[PDB]
């Protein structure tokens, strides 16, 4: 009728009412006041008001963009957050506090069924657990979003629902250090950038272990490829790693007077060439909150004054000035003396190793010469390399605390990535970062699109192929195949020749003109873009080699091996081959296969706009991600297929009850057919399988209200 919605060129579309039609065009009033001339087919119809602000996507009666884009702005303008789209969830960032994660509420939704309590984090970790116990198998919590879409926030959220679910049923029990890690991680693994005051720098993956009944019994954390760059570099906008500014603070007076620095980041050149302040953040508190987090979970005072001595070290080597008498020599002594103090080495030592690295001919050796660019490159790579493998331990030592020896049969792991982002200047980390999202988003494709009509197919049930346009394998291939971006840049790694010209030259001659989703380049200067799924991203490639192979002087390797302070010989203990993005492929692959093993829970978090500001709703960047993320298509497999599904032998025993008196029929399928077709229930909404008994949207959950009845 009347009530439509229209395309904009500003707002993507608005609601609008028709008032005339002729030749194809309709002539329509929009909410704006504008008096708007549009062809019939880009006319959408709005759902009827009683399905305003519904809370599952799936039950609207027109599925199209903006009724989608409109039932999830008319949600968050009253600030309901979350949103069901058939079997996944929607989230848009408030950017402010809000009543909604309080423990009567993670108590109220204790065990509630999707239905009967209204969309929440706290829902998806409730019905993951539901999931665990019934089919006693292994649950995945996948969040996905760009840079400050809300991913961390929302998996803190599921961490403190079961740990708070526990708690009613080192220094703290579990529970407490589960909670404790996060802390502890961010303070050196994240930072501020221009899209998130408090973004995360490193991917994790963390295992929520369970016993038979479901008690929380133990958990383990693994971290992936951390942005060891920002340790020594930063862009205008951004920051260096929390930890930094958070000693600086001088909170703990104690801590500048063992670190031998002062109270001013801008004394420090590798953690002040961008910003040192952020309004959102108090440093001052922040450094308690990490201290009593190593607390919590039991690392010691010598493990905590380490980790602090090795920070306050790498600011020390950052300080160290060479010059010539081509030949590098130290310009001045007093930071290599406060770095190696710190470090447990010689100053005369190290500055030796600086400037006259080794090369190894056999069993003898040849002394090499440096230049001052040589070795204040060599200087960055060790602090970044301290910074890393400092990091690492840290998580090593946070699961040796979490790992309790309770007994487990299942876990729950939930995936917080780095997320998708775009800088004025963007290098090797952010194709990495980018990577993993895309990966992430084909995962999506696979297991909703690919996997689920597979099922069909296979279990007998009637079925048409709908190709839903949504396959990244084109633009993943382009980046980890070989002869590929990364396998480029691998096989021009090793190659003593080869130069950041000679790997852009190889970049070119095979895929500019020759691979759809790579392109020349349109601020600084970039060298190729990438048309990623979620954008357009323009990547320089200077120093994509020395990065890739990551080369380090190991005549102060060495030195750190057989360093005085404990911490520094065992980070560089097994030191000794593969290049960061071939071990990236490898890992990524790795965490794709054991998501495969798992019944995954895809949660979908939205930034709202570019400036933090609570309630306000950019159309078209909203939209963007609403299509890239294929929340539609996602829909209309729920909508159109079976999205449940249960083994005949499973459903025999669960829903007897509904029906005794049915099956008073040896075969499970026998028993089944029965058993449904006796009940009151629209006998179309199910279909059966070879294995299994299909089920259209919505008819378990009514299945399952009738169980909860008779029980
Ligand atoms: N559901 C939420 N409730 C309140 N604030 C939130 C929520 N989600 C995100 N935020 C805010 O947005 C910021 C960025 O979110 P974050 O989880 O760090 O993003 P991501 O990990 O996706 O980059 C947070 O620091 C917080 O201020
Ligand atoms: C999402 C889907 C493939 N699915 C189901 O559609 C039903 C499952 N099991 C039944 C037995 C169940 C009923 C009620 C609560 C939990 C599990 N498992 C499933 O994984
Ligand atoms: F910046 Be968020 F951690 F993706
Ligand atoms: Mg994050």
Redesign the pocket.
């Known amino acids: 009728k009347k009530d439509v919605f229209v395309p904009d060129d500003k707002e993507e579309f608005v609601k609008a009412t028709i008032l005339s039609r002729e030749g194809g065009k309709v002539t329509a009033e929009t909410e704006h006041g504008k008096t708007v001339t549009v062809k019939e087919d880009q006319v959408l119809q709005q759902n009827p008001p009683k399905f305003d602000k519904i809370e599952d996507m799936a039950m609207l009666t027109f599925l199209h963009e903006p009724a989608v884009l409109y039932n999830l702005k008319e949600r968050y303008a009253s600030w309901m957050?979350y949103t069901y789209s058939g079997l996944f969830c929607v989230?848009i960032?408030?950017?402010?506090?809000?009543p909604v994660?309080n423990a009567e509420v993670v108590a109220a939704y204790r065990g509630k069924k999707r239905s009967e309590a209204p969309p929440h984090?706290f829902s998806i970790s409730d019905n993951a657990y539901q999931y665990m116990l019934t089919d006693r198998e292994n649950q995945s919590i996948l969040?996905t979003?760009?840079?400050?879409?809300?991913?961390?926030?929302?998996?803190?959220?599921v961490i403190q629902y079961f740990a708070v679910i526990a708690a009613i049923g080192g220094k703290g029990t579990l529970e407490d250090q589960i909670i404790q890690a996060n802390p502890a991680l961010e303070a050196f693994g994240?930072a501020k950038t221009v899209?998130?005051?408090?973004?995360?720098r490193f991917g994790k993956f963390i295992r929520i272990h369970f016993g038979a009944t479901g008690k929380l019994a133990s958990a383990d954390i693994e971290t992936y490829l951390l942005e060891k760059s920002r340790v020594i570099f930063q862009l205008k906008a951004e920051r260096d790693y929390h930890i930094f500014y958070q000693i600086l603070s001088n909170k703990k007076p104690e801590l500048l007077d063992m670190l031998l620095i002062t109270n001013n980041p801008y004394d420090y050149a590798f953690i002040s060439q961008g910003e040192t302040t952020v309004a959102?953040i108090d440093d001052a508190e922040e450094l308690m909150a990490t201290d009593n987090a190593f607390d919590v979970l039991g690392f010691t005072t010598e493990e905590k004054n380490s980790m602090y001595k090795l920070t306050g070290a790498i600011m020390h080597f950052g300080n160290m000035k060479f010059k010539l008498k081509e030949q590098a020599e130290p310009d001045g002594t007093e930071e290599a003396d406060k770095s190696a103090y710190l470090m447990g080495l010689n100053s005369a030592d190290l500055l030796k190793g600086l400037c006259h690295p080794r090369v190894k001919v056999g069993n003898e050796y040849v002394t090499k010469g440096q230049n001052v660019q040589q070795v204040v490159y060599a200087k960055g790579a060790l602090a970044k390399a301290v910074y890393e493998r400092m990091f690492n331990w840290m998580v090593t030592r946070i699961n040796a605390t979490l790992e309790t020896k309770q007994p487990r049969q299942y876990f729950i792991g939930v995936l917080?990535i780095?997320?998708f982002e775009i800088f004025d200047f963007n290098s090797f980390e952010q194709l990495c970062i980018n990577f993993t999202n895309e990966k992430l988003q084909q995962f999506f494709n696979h297991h909703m699109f690919v996997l689920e009509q597979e099922e069909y197919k296979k279990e007998g049930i009637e079925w048409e192929f709908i190709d839903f346009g949504m396959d990244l394998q084109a633009c993943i291939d382009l980046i980890e195949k070989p002869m590929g971006i990364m396998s480029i840049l691998e096989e021009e790694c090793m190659f003593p020749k080869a130069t950041d010209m000679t790997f852009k030259a190889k970049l070119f001659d095979n895929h500019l003109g020759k691979s759809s989703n790579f392109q020349k380049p349109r601020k600084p200067e970039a060298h190729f873009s990438l048309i990623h799924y979620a954008g357009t991203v323009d990547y320089n490639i200077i120093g994509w080699l020395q990065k890739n192979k990551d080369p380090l002087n190991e005549t102060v390797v060495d030195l750190y091996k057989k360093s005085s302070l404990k911490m520094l010989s065992s980070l560089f203990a097994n030191y000794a081959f593969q290049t960061v993005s071939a071990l990236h492929r490898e890992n990524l692959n790795k965490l794709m296969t054991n998501l495969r093993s798992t019944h995954p829970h895809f949660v979908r978090?939205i930034?709202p706009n570019e400036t933090?500001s609570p309630g306000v709703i950019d159309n078209p960047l909203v939209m963007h991600q609403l299509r890239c993320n294929g929340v539609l298509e996602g829909i209309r497999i729920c909508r159109k297929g079976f999205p449940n599904r249960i083994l005949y032998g499973d459903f025999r025993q669960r829903y007897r009850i509904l029906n005794p008196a049915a099956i008073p029929d040896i075969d499970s399928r026998k028993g089944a057919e029965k058993l449904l077709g006796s009940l009151d229930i629209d006998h179309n909404q199910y279909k059966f399988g070879h294995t299994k008994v299909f089920f259209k949207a919505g008819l378990l959950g009514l299945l399952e209200e009738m169980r909860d009845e008779r029980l």
Do not use: F, Q
Not at 145 to 157: D, H, L, M
């Open positions: 957050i989230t960032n408030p950017y402010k506090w809000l994660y984090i969040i979003g760009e840079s400050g879409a809300g991913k961390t926030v929302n998996t803190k959220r994240n899209r998130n005051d408090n973004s995360s959102s917080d780095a997320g978090c930034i933090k």
